[PDB]
């Protein structure tokens, strides 16, 4: 579930790469204001989009979240990350949603696909499209 102006890769970047504040309540405003709902949980990876693209080059493996998909890739190394958990739902005023933040250093598994032909930049033929799991 993403706003229509973003490709899957651009939405992946918005949700998981471009944390706009180190504090979850503030950073989550971006995701929530775009998807018109307070997301119950979300992981921000302190890594770069280029680094994730390179993870897409690691061997294909089964996606933990969907046993039938084989477009997943393991990060190889751990990264610092911040996991945000909703503490104070507010469906009629999403700016009032508050979150806890949990820091960790973990591996991740990402699903990757070929880029959106019309809208993703040709620089990256293969892009991350979903954060499948953190381990």
Swiss-Prot record:
<keyword id="KW-0325">Glycoprotein</keyword>
<protein>
    <recommendedName>
        <fullName>Non-secretory ribonuclease</fullName>
        <ecNumber>4.6.1.18</ecNumber>
    </recommendedName>
</protein>
<dbReference type="GO" id="GO:0070062">
    <property type="term" value="C:extracellular exosome"/>
</dbReference>
<dbReference type="GO" id="GO:0003676">
    <property type="term" value="F:nucleic acid binding"/>
</dbReference>
<dbReference type="GO" id="GO:0004522">
    <property type="term" value="F:ribonuclease A activity"/>
</dbReference>
<feature type="glycosylation site" description="C-linked (Man) tryptophan">
    <location>
        <position position="8"/>
    </location>
</feature>
<keyword id="KW-0732">Signal</keyword>
<dbReference type="GO" id="GO:0002227">
    <property type="term" value="P:innate immune response in mucosa"/>
</dbReference>
<dbReference type="GO" id="GO:0035578">
    <property type="term" value="C:azurophil granule lumen"/>
</dbReference>
<keyword id="KW-0255">Endonuclease</keyword>
<keyword id="KW-0458">Lysosome</keyword>
<feature type="modified residue" description="3'-nitrotyrosine">
    <location>
        <position position="34"/>
    </location>
</feature>
<comment type="similarity">
    <text>Belongs to the pancreatic ribonuclease family.</text>
</comment>
<keyword id="KW-0145">Chemotaxis</keyword>
<dbReference type="GO" id="GO:0004540">
    <property type="term" value="F:RNA nuclease activity"/>
</dbReference>
<keyword id="KW-0456">Lyase</keyword>
<feature type="disulfide bond">
    <location>
        <begin position="38"/>
        <end position="97"/>
    </location>
</feature>
<dbReference type="GO" id="GO:0006935">
    <property type="term" value="P:chemotaxis"/>
</dbReference>
<feature type="glycosylation site" description="N-linked (GlcNAc...) asparagine">
    <location>
        <position position="60"/>
    </location>
</feature>
<feature type="active site" description="Proton acceptor">
    <location>
        <position position="16"/>
    </location>
</feature>
<feature type="disulfide bond">
    <location>
        <begin position="24"/>
        <end position="84"/>
    </location>
</feature>
<keyword id="KW-0944">Nitration</keyword>
<dbReference type="GO" id="GO:0006401">
    <property type="term" value="P:RNA catabolic process"/>
</dbReference>
<feature type="glycosylation site" description="N-linked (GlcNAc...) asparagine">
    <location>
        <position position="18"/>
    </location>
</feature>
<dbReference type="GO" id="GO:0051607">
    <property type="term" value="P:defense response to virus"/>
</dbReference>
<feature type="active site" description="Proton donor">
    <location>
        <position position="130"/>
    </location>
</feature>
<keyword id="KW-0540">Nuclease</keyword>
<comment type="function">
    <text>This is a non-secretory ribonuclease. It is a pyrimidine specific nuclease with a slight preference for U. Cytotoxin and helminthotoxin. Selectively chemotactic for dendritic cells. Possesses a wide variety of biological activities.</text>
</comment>
<keyword id="KW-1015">Disulfide bond</keyword>
<feature type="glycosylation site" description="N-linked (GlcNAc...) asparagine">
    <location>
        <position position="85"/>
    </location>
</feature>
<feature type="glycosylation site" description="N-linked (GlcNAc...) asparagine">
    <location>
        <position position="93"/>
    </location>
</feature>
<dbReference type="GO" id="GO:0005615">
    <property type="term" value="C:extracellular space"/>
</dbReference>
<feature type="binding site">
    <location>
        <begin position="39"/>
        <end position="43"/>
    </location>
    <ligand>
        <name>substrate</name>
    </ligand>
</feature>
<feature type="disulfide bond">
    <location>
        <begin position="63"/>
        <end position="72"/>
    </location>
</feature>
<feature type="glycosylation site" description="N-linked (GlcNAc...) asparagine">
    <location>
        <position position="66"/>
    </location>
</feature>
<keyword id="KW-0378">Hydrolase</keyword>
<dbReference type="GO" id="GO:0016829">
    <property type="term" value="F:lyase activity"/>
</dbReference>
<comment type="subunit">
    <text>Interacts with and forms a tight 1:1 complex with RNH1. Dimerization of two such complexes may occur.</text>
</comment>
<dbReference type="GO" id="GO:0005576">
    <property type="term" value="C:extracellular region"/>
</dbReference>
<feature type="disulfide bond">
    <location>
        <begin position="56"/>
        <end position="112"/>
    </location>
</feature>
């Amino acid at each position: 579930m993403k706003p229509p102006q973003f490709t899957w890769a651009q939405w992946f970047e918005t949700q998981h790469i471009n944390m706009t504040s180190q504090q979850c309540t503030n950073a989550m405003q971006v995701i929530n204001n775009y998807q018109r709902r307070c997301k119950n949980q979300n992981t921000f990876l302190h890594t770069t989009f280029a680094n994730v693209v390179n993870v897409c080059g690691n061997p294909n493996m089964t996606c933990p979240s969907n046993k039938t998909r084989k477009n997943c890739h393991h990060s190889g190394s751990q990264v610092p990350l911040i996991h945000c958990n909703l503490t104070t739902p507010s469906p009629q005023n999403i700016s009032n949603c508050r979150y806890a933040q949990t820091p960790a250093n973990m591996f991740y598994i990402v699903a990757c696909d070929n880029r959106d032909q019309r809208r993703d930049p040709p620089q990256y033929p293969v892009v991350p499209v979903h954060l499948d799991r953190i381990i």
